[PDB]
């Protein structure tokens, strides 16, 4: 179940670039901006 959602997160990070210079906080914001983020929250 929730296992599929976890996989999406890992795949999302791989799909998007995450420069070492950046930071986890910045990387998190990057995925949040993505419209997909809104859909993830709705999950319904």
Swiss-Prot record:
Location relative to the cell: Nucleus speckle; Nucleus matrix
Tissue: Expressed in the brain cortex (at protein level). Widely expressed.
Top-rank taxon: Eukaryota
Domain FF: 2-44
General function of this protein: Binds to WASL/N-WASP and suppresses its translocation from the nucleus to the cytoplasm, thereby inhibiting its cytoplasmic function. Plays a role in the regulation of cell morphology and cytoskeletal organization. Required in the control of cell shape and migration. May play a role in cytokinesis. May be involved in pre-mRNA splicing.
Family: Belongs to the PRPF40 family.
Domains as described in the record: The WW domains are essential for localization to nuclear speckles.
Description of how the protein assembles with itself and partners: Interacts with the N-terminus of HTT. Interacts with the phosphorylated C-terminal domain of POLR2A. Interacts with AKAP8L, SF1, SRPK1, ENAH, ATBF1 and MECP2. Interacts through the WW domains with formin proline-rich regions and with WASL/N-WASP.
Descriptive protein name: Pre-mRNA-processing factor 40 homolog A
Biological source species: Homo sapiens (Human)
Gene field: PRPF40A
């Amino acid at each position: 179940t929730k296992e599929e959602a976890k996989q999406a997160f890992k795949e999302l990070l791989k799909e998007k670039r995450v420069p070492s210079n950046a930071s986890w906080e910045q990387a998190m914001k990057m995925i949040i901006n993505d419209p997909r983020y809104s859909a993830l929250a709705k999950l319904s």
